[PDB]
Design a binder for this molecule. Structure first.
Ligand SMILES: OC[C@H]1O[C@@H](n2c[nH+]c3cncnc32)[C@H](O)[C@@H]1O
Ligand SMILES: [Zn+2]
Length: 349
């Protein structure tokens, strides 16, 4: 009994956080790289989370498997193809997948991630590989998929290259630029490289989204909106703490990419207090429901819908509403955006 057994739109999920324990296990053995466990079940209990951690603590779960995928063309392409398949099964008709091309390369990246040995999988090459896997999956499962390239908060030197990658692969799946990573790194939103990459995104027409306000204060969101110029805000739960900012973003119709389950598990939400999404629902705010990192939260898109249904009392009326806003707020060109909307209204009939 799915909470919302109808077509959905997902705007917030990381490719490297949506991998199958099985594929992780396959390449661990195939490359002879160690994993913390040798059974999908135990691998899933080590990588996955049962209780709230902190943002930096949760972020460490990637250390376990990223080395197994990074540097391998076959793996990079495969996880891209299998991602589409996963989303197809969840009943998602349009998705924007995000990831850091740098954390998957093993050549022309400094610092070299995961202590890898120089290879030939360049940051540009990883973008192309994901594109190919994404496209093959679209043909095979029939859903539309697009990508977003992430800037890492702690590594602003990578930022201008991410911008260049967005320019090159513009619409070749690539639709936007994101700022992901450790939100707690004081002043990370303001590092020159990040600011300059975003200034360039604005002048070159490249779409923008920024993780902000999951753990930081209203000010981090204010910097994302005012200085960085995001078109959307990843999370943004703390925005409501500044009635002025909240009400202003509400007026401009700012889109908040909400991830309920994630907010609880990253410690970002005290289950005693009313979840920010409730305020958004009541205020009729522009927001979407997202999974964020399904692998680590041992979850599915339905996890998040069920959660808002059971607690927070969401209805099908709201599920349809927020999905229309997600389609209106997607980074799809106008014509593709109309087609998506047409599709949903038909199926919501
Ligand atoms: O998907 C690109 C990167 O975004 C970071 N990321 C994943 N989930 C996140 C939640 N919040 C902030 N950053 C996150 C990860 O370090 C992953 O390597
Ligand atoms: Zn995220």
């Amino acid at each position: 009994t799915p909470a919302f057994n109808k077509p959905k739109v997902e705007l917030h999920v990381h490719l490297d956080g949506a991998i199958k324990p099985e594929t992780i296990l396959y390449f661990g053995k195939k490359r002879g790289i160690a994993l913390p466990a040798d059974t999908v079940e135990e691998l899933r209990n080590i990588i996955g989370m049962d209780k709230p951690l902190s943002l930096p603590g949760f972020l460490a779960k990637f250390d376990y498997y990223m080395p197994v995928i990074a540097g391998c063309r076959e793996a990079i392409k495969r996880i891209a193809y299998e991602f589409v398949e996963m989303k197809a099964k969840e009943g998602v008709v349009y998705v924007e997948v995000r990831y850091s091309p740098h954390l998957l390369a093993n050549s022309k990246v400094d610092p070299m991630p995961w202590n890898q040995t120089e290879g030939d999988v360049t940051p540009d090459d990883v973008v192309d590989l994901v594109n190919q896997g994404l496209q093959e999956g679209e043909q095979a499962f029939g859903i539309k998929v697009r990508s977003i390239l992430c800037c890492m908060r702690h590594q602003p030197s990578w930022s201008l290259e991410v911008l260049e990658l967005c320019k090159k692969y513009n619409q070749k799946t690539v639709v936007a630029m994101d700022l992901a990573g450790d939100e707690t790194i004081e002043g990370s939103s303001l590092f020159p490289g990040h600011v300059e990459a975003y200034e360039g995104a604005v002048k070159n027409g490249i779409h923008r989204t920024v993780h902000a306000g999951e753990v930081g204060s209203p000010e981090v969101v204010r910097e994302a909106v005012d200085i960085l110029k995001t078109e959307r805000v990843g999370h943004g739960y703390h925005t409501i703490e500044d009635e002025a900012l909240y009400n202003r973003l509400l007026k401009e119709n700012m889109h908040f990419e909400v991830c309920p389950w994630s907010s609880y598990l990253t410690g970002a939400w005290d289950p005693k207090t009313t979840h920010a999404v409730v305020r958004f629902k009541n205020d009729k705010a522009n927001y979407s429901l997202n999974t964020e990192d399904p692998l680590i939260f041992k979850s599915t898109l339905d996890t998040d819908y069920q959660m808002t249904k059971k607690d927070m009392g969401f209805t099908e009326e709201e599920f349809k509403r927020l999905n229309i806003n997600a389609a209106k707020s997607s980074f799809l060109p106008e014509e593709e955006k109309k087609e998506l909307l047409e599709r949903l209204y038909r199926e919501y009939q």
